[model samples]
Target chain A: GHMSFLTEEEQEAIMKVLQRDAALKRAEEEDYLIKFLALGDSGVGKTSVLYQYTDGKFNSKFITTVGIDFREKRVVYRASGPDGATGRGQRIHLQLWDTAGLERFRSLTTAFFRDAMGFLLLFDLTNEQSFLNVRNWISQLQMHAYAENPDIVLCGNKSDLEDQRVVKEEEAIALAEKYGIPYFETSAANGTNISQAIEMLLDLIMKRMERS
Target chain B: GHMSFLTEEEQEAIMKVLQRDAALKRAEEERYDYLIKFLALGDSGVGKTSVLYQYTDGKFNSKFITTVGIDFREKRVVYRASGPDGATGRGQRIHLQLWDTAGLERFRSLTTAFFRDAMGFLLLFDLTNEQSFLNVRNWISQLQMHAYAENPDIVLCGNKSDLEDQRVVKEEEAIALAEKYGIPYFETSAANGTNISQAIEMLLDLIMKRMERS
Candidate 1:
């Protein structure tokens, strides 16, 4: 018998088990909870994108997520390593938690920061003000967690509207580079590049988890 | 007579009439009154896209025009054709006076110039966030309506969620204020793309007629 990386099939099975366990835990009304924080400025469309990703539906309507809305999504990650004699891999399950993007709700967010495995920093590309506030958002995340503890991905949203672009793509890439994080341009409207962004962040998290 | 640069078939008669009466004044009762403006904002979902388009149908749904509270939409176009050309090539009766962004509060200062012309602003409300919807009226009056005149068009709309969570304000209550303020009303779901386009088109008509008088 030997250790092995997780295959896609194994990952899916692992996800099913994790989802069931999460449901059971919720059913038991457990006090402890795992949280993944979504940080951004007001009007950055953080809530919309969160809901869009959680539900696999793009809602063009707008409603700012006031406090925090928790949506539990099960993700399967293929484990990387040596395989057993059977040459089969293993898989891991990830629980994603979506949080609100308002300063007034900062306290609620801080509560989640300690346990967060990763941070999804969302900014609206059409809004220069929102993009400008990314530094503040990142600073807040760093303040709550270890400087390099949480895996972060900077998401530049609303890439669908090219005509009304306010922030240049290069600027976003430069900012991501400066922060030493990966960047993704997404459109939750048309579901453009959203899955790729999520996958990139999850992969980073898994790699970090493996290192630890 | 001579022909001019008015093609599009529908515009031909209007052009001919314009030649004779450049400053034509007719005391006919206008078609539509009121202006709606839409603002685009948010991170893609949260139902802004569908709600923005759902209102043109003849029947109105309670869930239709509600989502995000700060965007503005107005009816400011009219459909008219040259000759007695009926509805075919009649052109859109109303023009869309749309703002298209929900998070206008952030851009409030820059967008004040559009306020004076807007007769009404539809604040999109999300069913998922009670607070977001609760702050709709205040945001429009206090934050968004700085340069706006008194009794300007303002509608509190709840969008998204086709009878799912039913979180904040009820449909009757939202519509009641609309009736009181004379704000042209609608409720829509942009998710199924339901009634979204029609809502905007109707709002456009309202604005176009208002502008015609002033």
Candidate 2:
């Protein structure tokens, strides 16, 4: 079925219908899929963030990701309704895609970005060069993504190395604003503010999906 | 003839004798050999440091390195050194080995330590990342080779996308202090990784030849 984008008010009404459909589907089926794509320069901690968030484990050791790394995570979120009634729970089957940062792999990343609902642009705070080059990857996103799909986020990684920082917080936020995207400075090694970053992007995607 | 490991005083005296003998040999007949090794954490800009110092006239884009990934470099240097007052000048040849920091390898601390006796270590700083540069002291401490060698040399490489506003460290002053510590410093862009690479090669050859003859 073709779904049209709905206004915020209309989405609330349609969400009620989705709740009913979800309940019925739950009675008949077992799962629904949610996919998120992690993109950025190589060595920017994309895979580390994804692994830390999804698995709740911190790894300081470096591991170069191959062409594309895939991980599946299951999350259960409670749902609420207007009349003091709770709806059937949501089982979020997250398919996380970690793409390579090299130029040769740009085409491969573009192909995967086609279906992603959330895009994370990761850069290292200590690497001023990598931070500035973020625009190149963002441009690639603009080229391959649908106009309304894939809400993007800019992430400044290695924030734990605060003392050795090259890029300032204000600079990252400014770039985020210029690009009209949300920004987060996170440390995968220390597990700081990482969950909030992931949750906020997920909420944005869910909200958009509800409207459509 | 064979010379055993000796005290600094003994080594100096032995060098005086060897200098006279070496001077008698023709340049074509002289034998020169030195090995230089480089070590750094994967992705820490080792390749660019080597290229920048060694290959002075190459053009490199910051983005090009991203696609090329990481690799090691080797270069040879030939120079003349004064032996003793009565001895002839000696020609020295040095072989430099530069290692790349790959993300998958967590070898920075260990590699830095292993390569400490490298005659000179090109301590690289990401011009874009202030933190990477700030950790220069920590990296030097990691090597722990300062006490053993007299006037151990470290070359600082500040690298990146050189936006004036984005620049965090001043180039000339940074070099001045590094010089104070017996290190030669260079500000380079490894996105233009060549300049960094060349710098490393030059330092390796210079230090190796100087140390061997002195």
Interface RMSD of 1: 29.2
Please identify model 2 stretches exceeding 4 Å from their true place.
Answer: A1-30, A78-89, A147-149, B1-214
- Encode model 2's per-residue lDDT on B65-128: one tens digit a residue: 3212223445565544544574535756755555443321222221222232244555666665
- Candidate 1 lDDT by residue in tens digits, A10-54: 334433433443354444443223335567877676666666677
Place model 1 in a CAPRI quality band: incorrect
Cand 1, B chain, TM: 0.52
- Candidate 1 lDDT for residue A24: 42
Candidate 1 lDDT score at position B73: 38
What's the C-alpha lDDT at position B52 in model 1? 50
